[PDB]
Design an enzyme around this catalytic site. Sequence first.
Site, PDB file in Angstrom:
ATOM      1  N   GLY A   1      19.443  54.930  13.688  1.00  0.00           N
ATOM      2  CA  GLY A   1      20.070  55.277  14.968  1.00  0.00           C
ATOM      3  C   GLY A   1      20.429  56.740  15.032  1.00  0.00           C
ATOM      4  O   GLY A   1      21.417  57.117  15.652  1.00  0.00           O
ATOM      5  N   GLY A   2      19.645  57.568  14.363  1.00  0.00           N
ATOM      6  CA  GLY A   2      19.752  59.021  14.579  1.00  0.00           C
ATOM      7  C   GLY A   2      19.652  59.344  16.066  1.00  0.00           C
ATOM      8  O   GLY A   2      18.782  58.833  16.793  1.00  0.00           O
ATOM      9  N   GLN A   3      20.591  60.158  16.520  1.00  0.00           N
ATOM     10  CA  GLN A   3      20.505  60.795  17.813  1.00  0.00           C
ATOM     11  C   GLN A   3      19.302  61.738  17.946  1.00  0.00           C
ATOM     12  O   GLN A   3      18.771  61.933  19.032  1.00  0.00           O
ATOM     13  CB  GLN A   3      21.814  61.488  18.110  1.00  0.00           C
ATOM     14  CG  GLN A   3      22.670  60.611  18.952  1.00  0.00           C
ATOM     15  CD  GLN A   3      24.114  61.009  18.986  1.00  0.00           C
ATOM     16  OE1 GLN A   3      24.606  61.489  20.002  1.00  0.00           O
ATOM     17  NE2 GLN A   3      24.818  60.799  17.872  1.00  0.00           N
ATOM     18  N   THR A   4      18.830  62.239  16.811  1.00  0.00           N
ATOM     19  CA  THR A   4      17.641  63.062  16.744  1.00  0.00           C
ATOM     20  C   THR A   4      16.680  62.416  15.755  1.00  0.00           C
ATOM     21  O   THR A   4      17.106  61.720  14.813  1.00  0.00           O
ATOM     22  CB  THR A   4      18.000  64.496  16.281  1.00  0.00           C
ATOM     23  OG1 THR A   4      18.854  65.094  17.257  1.00  0.00           O
ATOM     24  CG2 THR A   4      16.736  65.374  16.092  1.00  0.00           C
TER      25      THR A   4
END
Lengths: 166, 181
Positions: free
Chosen positions: B69-72
Site C-alpha cells: 500500500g505504498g502511496q508511491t
Amino acid sequence: AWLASLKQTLGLLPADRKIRVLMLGLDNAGKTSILYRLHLGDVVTTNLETLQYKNISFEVWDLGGCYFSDTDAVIYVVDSTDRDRMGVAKHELYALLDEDELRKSLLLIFANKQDLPDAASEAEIAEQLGVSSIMNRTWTIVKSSSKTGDGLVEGMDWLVERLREQ
Amino acid sequence: WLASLKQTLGLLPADRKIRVLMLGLDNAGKTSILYRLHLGDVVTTVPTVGVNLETLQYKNISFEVWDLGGQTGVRPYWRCYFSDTDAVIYVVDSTDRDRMGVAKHELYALLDEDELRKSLLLIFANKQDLPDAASEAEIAEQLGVSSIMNRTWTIVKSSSKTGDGLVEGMDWLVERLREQG
Ligand SMILES: Nc1nc2c(ncn2[C@@H]2O[C@H](COP(=O)(O)OP(=O)(O)O)[C@@H](O)[C@H]2O)c(=O)[nH]1
Ligand SMILES: Nc1nc2c(ncn2[C@@H]2O[C@H](COP(=O)(O)OP(=O)(O)O)[C@@H](O)[C@H]2O)c(=O)[nH]1
Ligand SMILES: [Mg+2]
Ligand SMILES: [Mg+2]
C-alpha cells in the site's frame, strides 16, 4: 574488432522496453567473467548475480550443481575446453529448453574461452550441444572469450537485432 | 496462553517446510513482530529494486515481510514471490482507523491471487496495548472480513509491546496446517 562498441549496440534496443536475459551454464563456464568483461556497471550477488543496464537485465546462476517467466533471451555459456563436462552442459541446456515459460526466448550460445588451445569449434559445440536439430526457436553460436573480449559484442548484437525483429 | 512459542512451533511436521507471508501496510508492526517472536536473526535482502524484504527462518518455517500500500510505486512485485505460500498473516495497526480502508484494499488485492488460493489467513489486529485500539469486531467490519471467501481465516488481537496474542496466532496457524492432514 567489432564495428560498434557494446553500449552503441545495446543503445539500439527500444530505450524503454524491459529486456530480461538469463545467462546460464555450468560453473566454470566463465559467466561471471563475461558480466565483468561487458563493462556495463557492477554485478550484484544475491546464489545469483545480476547486471542491470538501462532497460536490460542479465541474471546468472550455475546449472547442474517459475523464475523463467517473461524471459526475452537465453545466453548459454559453455567452456569450449571442457570436453567431459560438455555432455552435462548439453543436458542442462535441454532441461532449460523444455520449459514452457522459455518457448519464445532467443538462444545465444557462447562457445567460450576460445583464447585457449583446447577449444572446440562452433560445429563441434553445435554437435556436442546437439543444437543442430533445434528448429522451433531462433538460435546461434558465437565463439567468445572473456580474456580477449572477442565474440561478446557480436553475440549481443545478434541478440539486439533478433529482439527488434521479434 | 499456555505454551511457549518454540513449543507451539515444534508441533509442526518437521519434514514439511512452511512458507508464511506476513504482510500489511507500513507501520502495522510487522518488523516488530519478527523480533518479538525471539526466534533468531531477521535477515534483510532486496529481491527487486525498491523492496526491503525481511525474512526470519526457524526450522521448517519461514516468515517473509514486506510493506503493502505504498502511496508511491507499483505494488512490490518479484517472480514467484507468492508460490507455495502456506499462510498469510495480515497485520493491521488497530489504532490507524484513517488507513483502515487502504488496509482492506490491500487485503483484498492479496486475496484475489490463486497462488494464494488456499492459504490460511491469520489477521493480527495489532498494537492492542494502546488504549485507542479498535475492537476485534470493529476491525472485522473495517477490513470487510464478512466478504472473505474460501479460506480458513480468523482475527486475533495482538501486540509486540506486550507479546500478547502472538502465541495464540502462531498456534492457530500451526493446528490449521495439521488439520490439512
Ligand atoms: N582462458 C580463459 N579463461 C577464462 C575465460 N573466462 C573465464 N575464465 C576463467 O574461467 C574460470 C571460471 O570463470 P567464472 O567467470 O567465475 O565462471 P562461472 O562459474 O560461470 O561464473 C576462472 O578461472 C576464470 O578466470 C576465458 O574467456 N578464457
Ligand atoms: N505501541 C505499540 N507500538 C508498536 C507495536 N508494534 C510496533 N510498534 C511500533 O510501531 C512503529 C512501526 O512498527 P514496525 O514494526 O516498524 O511496523 P512495520 O512497518 O509493519 O514493519 C514503531 O514505532 C514500532 O516500534 C505495538 O504492538 N504496540
Ligand atoms: Mg559465477
Ligand atoms: Mg518493517
